Amino acid sequence: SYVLGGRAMEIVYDEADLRRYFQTAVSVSNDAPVLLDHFLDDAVEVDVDAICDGEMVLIGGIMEHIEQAGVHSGDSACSLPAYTLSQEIQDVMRQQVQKLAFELQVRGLMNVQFAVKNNEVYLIEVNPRAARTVPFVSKATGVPLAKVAARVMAGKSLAEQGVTKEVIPPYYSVKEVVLPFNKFPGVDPLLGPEMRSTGEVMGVGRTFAEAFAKAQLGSNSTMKKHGRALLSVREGDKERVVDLAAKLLKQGFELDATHGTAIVLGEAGINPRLVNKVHEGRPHIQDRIKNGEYTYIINTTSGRRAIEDSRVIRRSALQYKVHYDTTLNGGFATAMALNADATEKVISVQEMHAQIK
Amino acid sequence: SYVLGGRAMEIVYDEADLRRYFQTAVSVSNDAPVLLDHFLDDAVEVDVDAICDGEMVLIGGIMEHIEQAGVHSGDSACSLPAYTLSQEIQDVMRQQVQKLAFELQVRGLMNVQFAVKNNEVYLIEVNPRAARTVPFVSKATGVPLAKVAARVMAGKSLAEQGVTKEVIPPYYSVKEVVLPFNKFPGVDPLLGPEMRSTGEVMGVGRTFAEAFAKAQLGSNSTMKKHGRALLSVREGDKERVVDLAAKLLKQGFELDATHGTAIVLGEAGINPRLVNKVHEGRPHIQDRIKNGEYTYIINTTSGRRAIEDSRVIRRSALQYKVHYDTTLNGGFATAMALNADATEKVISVQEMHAQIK
Numbered sequence: 001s002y003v004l005g006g007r008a009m010e011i012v013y014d015e016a017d018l019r020r021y022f023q024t025a026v027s028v029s030n031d032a033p034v035l036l037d038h039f040l041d042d043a044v045e046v047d048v049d050a051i052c053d054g055e056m057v058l059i060g061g062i063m064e065h066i067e068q069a070g071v072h073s074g075d076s077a078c079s080l081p082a083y084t085l086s087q088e089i090q091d092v093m094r095q096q097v098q099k100l101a102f103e104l105q106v107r108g109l110m111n112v113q114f115a116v117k118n119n120e121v122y123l124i125e126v127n128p129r130a131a132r133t134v135p136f137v138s139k140a141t142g143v144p145l146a147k148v149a150a151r152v153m154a155g156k157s158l159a160e161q162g163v164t165k166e167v168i169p170p171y172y173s174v175k176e177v178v179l180p181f182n183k184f185p186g187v188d189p190l191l192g193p194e195m196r197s198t199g200e201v202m203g204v205g206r207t208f209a210e211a212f213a214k215a216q217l218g219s220n221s222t223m224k225k226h227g228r229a230l231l232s233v234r235e236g237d238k239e240r241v242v243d244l245a246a247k248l249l250k251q252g253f254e255l256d257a258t259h260g261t262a263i264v265l266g267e268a269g270i271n272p273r274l275v276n277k278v279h280e281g282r283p284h285i286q287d288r289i290k291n292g293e294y295t296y297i298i299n300t301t302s303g304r305r306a307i308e309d310s311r312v313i314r315r316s317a318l319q320y321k322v323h324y325d326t327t328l329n330g331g332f333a334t335a336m337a338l339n340a341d342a343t344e345k346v347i348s349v350q351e352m353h354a355q356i357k
Numbered sequence: 358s359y360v361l362g363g364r365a366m367e368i369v370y371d372e373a374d375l376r377r378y379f380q381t382a383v384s385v386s387n388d389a390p391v392l393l394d395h396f397l398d399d400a401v402e403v404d405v406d407a408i409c410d411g412e413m414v415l416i417g418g419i420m421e422h423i424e425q426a427g428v429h430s431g432d433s434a435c436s437l438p439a440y441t442l443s444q445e446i447q448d449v450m451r452q453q454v455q456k457l458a459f460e461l462q463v464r465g466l467m468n469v470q471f472a473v474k475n476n477e478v479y480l481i482e483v484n485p486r487a488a489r490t491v492p493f494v495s496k497a498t499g500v501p502l503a504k505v506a507a508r509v510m511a512g513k514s515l516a517e518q519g520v521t522k523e524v525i526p527p528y529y530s531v532k533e534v535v536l537p538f539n540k541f542p543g544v545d546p547l548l549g550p551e552m553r554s555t556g557e558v559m560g561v562g563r564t565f566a567e568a569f570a571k572a573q574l575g576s577n578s579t580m581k582k583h584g585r586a587l588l589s590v591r592e593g594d595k596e597r598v599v600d601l602a603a604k605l606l607k608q609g610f611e612l613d614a615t616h617g618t619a620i621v622l623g624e625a626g627i628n629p630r631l632v633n634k635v636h637e638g639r640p641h642i643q644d645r646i647k648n649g650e651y652t653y654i655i656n657t658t659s660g661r662r663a664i665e666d667s668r669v670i671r672r673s674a675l676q677y678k679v680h681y682d683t684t685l686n687g688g689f690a691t692a693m694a695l696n697a698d699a700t701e702k703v704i705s706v707q708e709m710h711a712q713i714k
């Protein structure tokens with residue numbers, strides 16, 4: 001309870017994992033209780049920032065995360081407006097928030113977090129305050145959300161302000177984060193339910209792929225538009241990995257796939273090059289990563305040990321300035337952006353805000 | 358001692374392998390000793406049938422085996438003339454035969470066995486009588502050795518008979534064997550030092566390839582000129598496998614391979630399609646073989662345990678009627694055969710013999 005940035009938050013998988021991470025949860029908890037939630041797999045995460053004045057509720061922005069629920073919103077890349085979420089589903093979300101605002105007695109700013117699994121909208125939480133997304137939203141929308149909510153807090157309704165209709169922008173605005181893993185080498189550069197990033201960037205595009213590509217480049221990525229890609233995905237992702245591989249191939253990448261991931265591609269008509277794990281042969285990935293053999297790496301994991309078992313690729317990839325994704329959705333966006341030219345067109349905030357009708 | 362067909366013969370890998378097969382070896386030895394011979398790895402096997410009249414030695418034929426030394430002569434396919442052996446080396450063997458014929462006091466037929474390793478002739482054994490290769494060589498050379506040798510035995514010299522020069526036919530002759538593994542399913546259809554074949558066929562061609570293809574077809578092989586091929590080879594064969602894989606590819610085959618093989622092929626630039634062993638996952642080889650996915654199977658093993666590990670490919674390949682090779686040389690030969698038409702041309706023996714000058 002009473003924490004932001006998911007402080008002391010951890011995905012428990014069993015008995016043990018609990019005893020281990022419970023005290024801590026409590027220590028930061030604030031004489032408030034520790035919630036034990038059930039983990040929604042393959043869920044899309046969503047952030048909603050809104051303003052309620054006791055009369056009305058104004059929808060600031062709906063942001064669809066790239067990375068799935070499980071990866072803190074704070075370490076997630078996000079899109080405004082949504083890039084895959086159905087209108088019907090958004091509308092649902094818009095309603096819930098409203099419901100919440102009022103029930104909550106909200107006055108000023110609020111931020112709501114959801115999860116969309118099998119077309120169902122689940123409630124993650126609500127921050128009865130200004131969230132870290134505001135600036136990004138304000139910038140994307142042209143609507144100085146902090147001002148307004150400030151005004152509201154003071155007595156000047158949204159109506160009196162003349163701010164009542166949710167703004168939907170012409171272009172795509174994508175936020176991407178920057179992680180401090182390079183400062184702390186002894187740390188597993190893996191993402192999760194706890195927030196570890198220090199900053200963020202924003203990409204604006206005609207297309208999601210255009211916005212994404214810009215945010216990525218701005219995030220200081222090392223991603224290349226050619227080369228060899230390494231694909232090492234986890235069981236669940238075994239199905240979509242095939243389509244992502246295809247895109248990479250279409251793009252001119254050559255592929256390598258560790259045992260299990262190759263088995264699947266191949267069974268689908270794609271034959272990657274087999275690569276040996278650390279404990280399998282020589283050369284092994286590490287050698288390969290190290291050799292400046294890859295330009296891209298996609299690696300999904302799942303389970304406390306499987307994670308400590310794959311820690312090496314990540315450390316190496318990070319260590320060798322190789323662009324790497326740890327989420328398949330993340331890989332899909334990375335791929336999509338291959339079809340874009342981050343240095344093609346430049347626009348000003350001014351122009352941006354000018355396109356808004 | 359005193360056995361033919363490799364009765365009770367076995368390749369031993371350690372002490373205990375030894376203690377397990379020793380008594381059996383003795384039991385069949387005829388109050389004669391058991392030889393312990395160091396195994397000759399990557400060596401070519403050669404058979405030589407000759408007649409000695411105490412005056413002169415007549416070389417009937419030198420047959421080079423397809424399968425290497427270690428696979429019983431009676432279970433190996435063979436070629437007359439030799440198809441890979443240098444003249445220089447064959448000549449070395451012709452002399453050894455003569456030297457032996459004379460020292461041993463041979464009077465009539467004899468059969469000599471050699472192994473070629475590193476351009477070095479090695480003696481395996483001498484069969485002081487007519488051998489199983491006699492009819493084939495006679496048919497191949499047009500010289501009725503049993504008749505000639507019978508006469509020599511009864512008093513008539515080679516000179517007198519006017520059979521004094523070795524015949525080297527204009528065509529290739531290849532012998533192939535038929536194995537009974539299909540009658541005894543609970544058996545691992547592996548080849549070895551002990552003879553298990555029940556019969557043989559003869560293939561005659563303008564080339565080694567033509568000869569082999571004919572031998573292979575008459576041996577009732579299920580081999581196809583297209584399809585998917587399964588490659589699963591041992592460590593030593595890791596070098597020549599590439600060439601083999603390549604050759605299958607140039608022929609239009611589609612490859613599948615297991616882990617290790619796939620690794621090597623990958624390194625060569627060949628990207629087979631990965632296939633799961635039986636302990637690896639699903640579908641696996643067994644499943645795929647069983648499904649009729651394959652038209653050719655090349656599977657080589659090495660060592661008691663590694664043999665017993667791969668037994669299932671062999672047994673399934675058999676049950677499902679897929680052509681399989683258990684030696685790389687075997688595979689290479691098969692490959693060659695791919696470039697020929699066994700149904701193309703036919704020739705009577707009368708006609709073959711007439712082509713001899």
Ligand SMILES: Nc1ncnc2c1ncn2[C@@H]1O[C@H](COP(=O)(O)OP(=O)(O)NP(=O)(O)O)[C@@H](O)[C@H]1O
Nearest residue numbers: 003004005006037038039040069070071072073193
């Ligand atoms: N039930 C759940 N299933 C899957 N993921 C979840 C679940 N609950 C939370 N998460 C993920 O874990 C993150 C952290 O949960 P949360 O309670 O929002 O932490 P927080 O510290 O309050 N964040 P914030 O106030 O925005 O700085 C969410 O952003 C989700 O990505």
Ligand SMILES: Nc1ncnc2c1ncn2[C@@H]1O[C@H](COP(=O)(O)OP(=O)(O)NP(=O)(O)O)[C@@H](O)[C@H]1O
Nearest residue numbers: 360361362363394395396397426427428429430550
């Ligand atoms: N040292 C060795 N290294 C490699 N292979 C060998 C060696 N000794 C024998 N072999 C193999 O073992 C087989 C059988 O040995 P061999 O002494 O010829 O048995 P055999 O019963 O007398 N045969 P046969 O009289 O021709 O029916 C040979 O054909 C070779 O394949």
Ligand SMILES: NCCC[C@H](N)C(=O)O
Nearest residue numbers: 075076077324325326327
């Ligand atoms: N949005 C967090 C950054 C993504 C990172 N490249 C990874 O795939 O983990």
Ligand SMILES: NCCC[C@H](N)C(=O)O
Nearest residue numbers: 432433434681682683687
């Ligand atoms: N001449 C021996 C038969 C070979 C069999 N196809 C296998 O390679 O074992």
Ligand SMILES: [Cl-]
Nearest residue numbers: 223224225226
């Ligand atoms: Cl580039």
Ligand SMILES: [K+]
Nearest residue numbers: 045067068071
């Ligand atoms: K997320």
Ligand SMILES: [K+]
Nearest residue numbers: 402425428433
């Ligand atoms: K042999």
Ligand SMILES: [Mn+2]
Nearest residue numbers: 003004005127
């Ligand atoms: Mn919070």
Ligand SMILES: [Mn+2]
Nearest residue numbers: 005073113125
């Ligand atoms: Mn949160």
Ligand SMILES: [Mn+2]
Nearest residue numbers: 360361482484
């Ligand atoms: Mn013998």
Ligand SMILES: [Mn+2]
Nearest residue numbers: 362430470482
């Ligand atoms: Mn022999």
